[PDB]
Amino acid sequence: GVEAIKRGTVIDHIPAQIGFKLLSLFKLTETDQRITIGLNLPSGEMGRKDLIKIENTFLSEDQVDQLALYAPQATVNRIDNYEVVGKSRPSLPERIDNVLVCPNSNCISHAEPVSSSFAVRKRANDIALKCKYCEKEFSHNVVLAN
């Protein structure tokens, strides 16, 4: 029923359907650690969730906050040698850098060797991202592409 973990991080309570979307978006799989992932789990609290346990790995303050963008109800459990030493949780980050691409085709960030960056913004239904460079705000849903 998933696995016992010595020390690390277990992001628990990821909404079923986003667990895989996260292991891809923030390079979690790109490790040499043992990762156990449970896609589609009975939660009660939610009908189904998802769950990732990354052994011998912690997240950072901004790292976890990056998760608010796809998983506010996630819970990052910091574990040290079987004790839940930490119960971390995502606020919106003020900026996500490096993972997204600006929908503006004529933004400089495509042509030049610089990392992306977006100021995040709680608008009034979803979340809005303003590019650093072209300064155009976009719906966060749009950014997550097609």
Partner 1 sequence: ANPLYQKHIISINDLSRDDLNLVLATAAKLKANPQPELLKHKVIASCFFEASTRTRLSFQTSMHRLGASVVGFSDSANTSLGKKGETLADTISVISTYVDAIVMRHPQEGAARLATEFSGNVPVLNAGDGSNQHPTQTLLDLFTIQQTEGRLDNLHVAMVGDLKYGRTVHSLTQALAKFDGNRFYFIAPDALAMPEYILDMLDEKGIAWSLHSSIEEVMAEVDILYMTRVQKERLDPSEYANVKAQFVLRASDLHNAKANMKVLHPLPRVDEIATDVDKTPHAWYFQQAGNGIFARQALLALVLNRDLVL
CB neighbour list of residue 22: distance below 8 Å, 6 or more residues apart: 11, 14, 28, 52, 67, 70, 71
Q: Is residue 103 part of the contact set for partner 1 (CB under 8 A)?
A: no
Choose the contact partner of 36 out of partner 1, a second copy, Zn ion, none; CB within 5 to 8 A by kind: a second copy
Determine contact, residues 64/76, Cβ cutoff 8 Å.
yes
Size of the site for partner 1 (CB under 8 A): 18
Tell me how far apart the alpha carbons of residues 22 and 39 are, in angstroms, rounded to a whole number.
12
Asked if 71 interacts with Zn ion (CB under 5 A), we say no
102, 120, 128, 143: residue in contact with Zn ion (rule CB under 5 A) = 102
- Do 90 and 65 form a contact (C-beta atoms < 8 A)? yes
- The item of a second copy, Zn ion, partner 1, none sharing an interface with residue 135, based on CB under 5 to 8 Å by kind, is partner 1
- Give the shortest CB-46-to-a second copy separation in angstroms: 13
